[PDB]
Paper text:
SWI/SNF chromatin remodelers reposition nucleosomes by translocating DNA around the histone octamer, and in vitro assays have shown that they move nucleosomes to the ends of linear DNA fragments before evicting the histones from the DNA. RSC has a molecular weight of ~1.1 MDa and is composed of 17 proteins, with two copies of Rsc8 and one copy of either Rsc1 or Rsc2. Seven of the proteins (Arp7, Arp9, Rsc6, Rsc8, Sfh1, Sth1 and Rsc9) are conserved in all eukaryotic SWI/SNF chromatin remodeling complexes, with Sth1 containing the ATPase domain that is responsible for the remodeling activity. We found that RSC is composed of five main lobes, three that form a relatively rigid core (head, body and arm) and two that are flexibly attached (leg and tail).
In order to shed light on the interaction of RSC with its substrate, we also obtained a 19 Å resolution map of RSC bound to a nucleosome core particle (NCP) modified with H3K4me3 and H3K(9/14/18)ac. We used an acetylated nucleosome due to the higher affinity of RSC for nucleosomes containing acetylated H3. We were able to unambiguously fit our structure of the RSC core within this map, along with previously published models of the Arp module (Arp7, Arp9, Rtt102 and Sth1-HSA) and the NCP. We do not observe any density for the ATPase domain of Sth1; however, based on the structure of the Sth1 homolog Snf2 bound to the NCP, we expect the catalytic subunit to bind super-helical location-2 (SHL2). Our data show two distinct modes of NCP binding by RSC, one where the whole tail is swiveled towards the nucleosome (termed swiveled), and one where only a small region emanating from the tail reaches towards the NCP (termed locked). Within our RSC-NCP structure, the arm lobe makes major interactions with the nucleosome, contacting both the acidic patch and nucleosomal DNA. The region of the arm that contacts the acidic patch appears to emanate from the C-terminal end of the RPT2 domain of Sfh1. The region of the arm lobe contacting the nucleosomal DNA appears to emanate from either the C-terminus of the SWIRM domain of Rsc8, which is predicted to be disordered, or the N-terminus of the Scaffold domain of Npl6, which includes a CRC domain which shares homology to the WH domain of SMARCB. From the RSC-NCP model, we observe that Sth1 then continues from the Scaffold II domain to the HSA helix that, along with Arp7, Arp9 and Rtt102, form the leg lobe. The fact that we observe nucleosome-bound RSC, even without a stable binding of the catalytic domain of Sth1 to the NCP, indicates that the contacts through the RSC core are sufficient for nucleosome engagement.
Author numbering:
A (entry chain B): 3 to 223, 275 to 375, 394 to 467
B (entry chain A): 2 to 39, 44 to 204, 214 to 262, 281 to 344, 380 to 466
C (entry chain R): 343 to 384
D (entry chain P): 1 to 12, 22 to 34, 54 to 70, 79 to 90
The structure:
Amino acid sequence: PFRQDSILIIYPRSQTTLVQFGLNEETFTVPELEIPTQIYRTTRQDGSYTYHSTNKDNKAELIKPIQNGEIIDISAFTQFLRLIFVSILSDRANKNQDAFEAELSNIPLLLITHHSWSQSDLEIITQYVFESLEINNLIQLPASLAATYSMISLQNCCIIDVGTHHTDIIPIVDYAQLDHLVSSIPMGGQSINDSLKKLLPQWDDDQIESLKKSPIFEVLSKNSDLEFNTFWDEKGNEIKVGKQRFQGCNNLIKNISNRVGLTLDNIDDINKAKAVWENIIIVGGTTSISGFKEALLGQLLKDHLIIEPEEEKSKREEEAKSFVPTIEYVQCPTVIKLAKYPDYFPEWKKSGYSEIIFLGAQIVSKQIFTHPKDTFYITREKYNMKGPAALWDVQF
Amino acid sequence: TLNRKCVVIHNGSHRTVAGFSNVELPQCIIPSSYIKRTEAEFIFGTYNMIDAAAEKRNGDEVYTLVDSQGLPYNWDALEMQWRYLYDTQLKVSPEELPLVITMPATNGKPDMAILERYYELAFDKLNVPVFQIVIEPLAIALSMGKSSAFVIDIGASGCNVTPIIDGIVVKNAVVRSKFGGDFLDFQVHERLAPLIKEEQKRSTDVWYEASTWIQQFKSTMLQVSEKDLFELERYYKEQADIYAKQQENNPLVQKKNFLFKPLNKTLTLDLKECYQFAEYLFKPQLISDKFSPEDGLGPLMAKSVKKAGASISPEQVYSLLLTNVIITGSTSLIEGMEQRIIKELSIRFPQYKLTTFANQVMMDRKIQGWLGALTMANLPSWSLGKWYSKEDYETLKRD
Amino acid sequence: QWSRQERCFQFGRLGASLHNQMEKDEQKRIERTAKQRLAALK
Amino acid sequence: MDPQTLITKANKKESWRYDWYQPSKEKYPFRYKTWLRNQEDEEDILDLKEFDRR
C-alpha cells in the first residue's frame, strides 16, 4: 500500500464535481474530470427508486443532490458517487484489462466534504463507501483544511469560499476548523449578475454573464483608462460597455467583510486571532475575477484594521509643530494580509487558484496514502470494529 | 467504551453550547437569548441576531431564556431554541440519541419543579429517548480529575461558589454572587458613556452593543489588580513621592488605547481606570451605599467554605477545599483574576496552603461547563449517571 | 484531547516540510529547463 | 461490463445498520439509535471524455 495510480479524489459541489484518479508523481495536475452534480431518478410502480445517467425514455426525474453546498438528498448523492466510481472502473478496466490486479486492486478514496454536512450524512456516506462501493480506505477531508494544506500548510487562517449563491466563512485555528464560528451568507457570484441587471436594464442574462466572464470586467482599488471598452457575446456578438464593467462586485464584497469581522472578533485567544487575520484565504470561481481578491482585502482593511483615526492623527502632527510616536492599540487586527500562494505548482499557476482546495487534497492524499501510518483514514479493520462510527476516530 | 453518541447541551444564562459527545469542541455556541420580531417570529443564533440587531427595526426585542439562578424560566422559548439547535446545528431528530444537559448547583429547593419541566420538554414535546442532567460545578470538577473541589465560577450572572466533597455537592454552602460579566458590561457602558455620546424595550441596542464593542473592550482593556486597589494606590503614591523627593514611575499612570469603531474614535484609559471595573466584583460597596462588603467575592468565598465546615473537622474541610480550588468561567479569564481570587482567599485563610487549578486555554473555560457535561457523556458505564427515561415521568405523574 | 491536538499539529507541521521539498524540487526542475533553454535555439 | 460486478472485482467483511438499541445493566427501560453490527443473517455508466476538459 498504496499505488499512486490508484488514489481517487472526489470533490463534489452544487453545480459540478471535480474528479481525479491517480497522482502524477512529478507535479500535481489540475483536475481534468468535471462531472455535473446530478443524477436521474426513475420511480418504479411499487414505490422504489432507480438511478440513471440519462433521462431514461423521459421516465426519470432530475435530482440535484447538493444545493448551496448542502446535501439535500443523501440517497441520490450516494448513487451519484457510485456512478462516478463505477465509470472510473469501467474506463480503466477496458484500457488495460489487467487492471483488477494492478490499478484497480486497492483504491483508497479521498472525499472532500463541506462544512454543512451532517454527522448523519457523513456516517451514511462512510457506510456507502465501505458496503456498497466495497472500497477499503477512506479519508473524509474538510474543504477548509484542503485549503490550508494547499496554502503551504497554515496553522491559523480564514477561508473565504465564494460560491454561486452563498459564501462560506471558515476560521482555522491550530489546524482545526472552528465549527462554532463557521457560517455562510446567502450571497455569492450571482449577486454580481443581479447588481449588473440593475445597472444595465436593457441587457439580458447571457449578455450580463458574458461581461462578468470577460477580460474587461474588473474590480478597481490599460483598461481602467478607457471610458468604454469592448467584449464579445457567447454567440460572437460585439458589445460595448462603460463604467458598469468596474461595478457589481461591491455589495458582495461588503457583505463578506462584515461577516469576516464578526467572525474573527469571536476568536477568544487574541494571539491566535492576530495570526488568522494575517492569513486570509479566498477561493471559488468568482475570485478569479480580475481585481476581486485585492478588492476584498481592501475592504477588510477599510472596515477592520486597528489604526489611528486620520483626523486624530492630523491634530497630533499639528501639535508637534511647536516627530509623532505611533499610538498603540490593545486590539487586533493591526495587520491584515492575504495568505501567500505557493508559486511552485506550475500547472496550478497556469490555471489560477480558484480551485486550489483540490490541490490541498492532492497533497494530503499523497502524504497520507504513501506512508504506513493509518492514523487519518478509516480502514476495513476499523470499519469492521466500529462501523461508520469509525469515522470519528480519525478526524483531524 | 459504550456504543452511543449523545447530544450535549449547556444552557448558560448568557451563552448556550451544543454539540455531539464524539468530538472535542461544540458544534455551536449561540446566545441564550433571542429576538422576537413582529405575526410573531423568533430569531436565534449569534450572526442571525447581530444582523437583525444592526437592522435597528422597531418591534424587534431581545428576551432571555435563563434567569440569574442559571435556570430556564421561559419554557416555550426554550423549546424553540432546542428545535433550532437540533434542526439547524446538530441536524438530527431529537428522538434518536441520548441527551445530556446541565443544571447549576442549588440549595435543593427549585430542583423538583425544574426536573418536571424538563420531563415535559424532553418527553411530551421533543420525544427524546432518555436524558441525564449533570450539575455544572460537579461536571467541570470531574472533567478536571477532581472528586472534591471548591469550584469558583465567574460567569455572566455573577460568581457561583460551590464546595464539592468526595463527589457530593454541599448544597447549604452553595453561594451565588450577583456581580459578574453582565454587571461589567453595565459599568463599562456607564463609564465610557460620555466619550461615545450615549450619556427592556431598548433591549436590542443594549444587547448588540454588549455583544460587539463592549465584549471587545472587556477582553482587551480590563485587568484585575492583584491587591486591594485603594491600597495599591496609597502605596504607589507613597513610593512615587520618594522617587520625586529623593532626586530633588507610578505604574497606575500607564495609558491604554482602544479604537472605538462606531465613531472611529480612540478611547484612552489609565491603568487605574482599567483596574477599576473588576474592583467592583470584589468591593461592590464602591458603587452603591446599598451593598455590604460581604456581597463582595472575597467575603463570599470565605462564607461558603465556613458554611462547608458546618457539614454534615472544620479545619479539615477548610484544608480539603483549599487544596482543590477550581477557578472557572468566561469572566475568570480577565487578566489578573486568578491571582486576586487567590490573594483574597489566602488572607481569609492564612493557616492553610491554597492550591488552585484552572484551564489555561482561553476557549476551554468559556465553555468549560459544556466540556464538563461532555466528559460525563463519555463515561464508560450507563450506571455512572442518573438517566431519566419516559418511565420515570410516568411514575412521577401518579398522584 | 492532548493526543489528538498533538497528532494534528504534527501533521500540519510536516506538510510545511513537504511543501519545502516540493518547492526545492520544482526549483531544480525549472532551473534545468531554463539553463538549456537560454543557451540553445530554438 | 455489469457495474455491480466491476465493484465486486475491484479492491480485493461486515455490515452495519442504524437502528434502535436497548442497553442492559436486565435491560434499561430506554432506547436509542446507534450503529449496530449485523448478525450472520441480517444501473448505468457514463463516458468520461465528455467530462474531460478540452
